[PDB]
């Protein structure tokens, strides 16, 4: 298939591996998650425009709306954690081991 499809998939897997290796910040996890969403938007948009499948042109907008509401929910979770501890560190979240 197309080579730009390989580059968008490699962008998705790069932001995947950035999401699967936490450094410190929870905001970095959310930014890797929304980079995953962005690569999904680009890939779905290129496939839908390329095949001229007209009724799926409304699909990437719905993807964008749902995952942006997902990101707003994530930011509210991060702000509750930032009120609890002070940072958005992931090593603060070690209460539920016991």
């Amino acid at each position: 298939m197309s080579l730009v499809y390989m580059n968008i998939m490699m962008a998705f897997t790069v932001s995947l591996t950035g999401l699967l290796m936490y450094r410190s910040h929870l905001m970095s996890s959310l930014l890797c998650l929304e980079g995953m969403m962005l690569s999904l938007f680009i890939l779905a948009t290129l496939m839908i425009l390329n095949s001229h499948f007209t009724l799926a042109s409304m699909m990437p907008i719905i993807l964008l709306v749902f995952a942006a509401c997902e990101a707003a929910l994530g930011l509210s979770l991060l702000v509750m954690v930032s009120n609890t501890y002070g940072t958005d560190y992931v090593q603060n979240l070690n209460l539920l081991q016991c």
């Binding site: 995947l16 591996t17 999401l19 699967l20 290796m21 936490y22 992931v90 090593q91 979240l93 070690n94 539920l96 081991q97 016991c98």
Partner: protein, 55 residues
Amino acid sequence: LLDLIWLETILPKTISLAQMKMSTTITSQKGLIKLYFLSFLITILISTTLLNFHE
């Protein structure tokens, strides 16, 4: 020597102490999220390359 010690040991006790040991090692986890998501990454890489599960 046999029927309070060795026959008592061979079938139930080695199983008992081995399940105790492996029960400790499975829940020997330090409860940190970086550990578990790095294990998810090692899961994805071993599943793709090491196991031929995409075939």
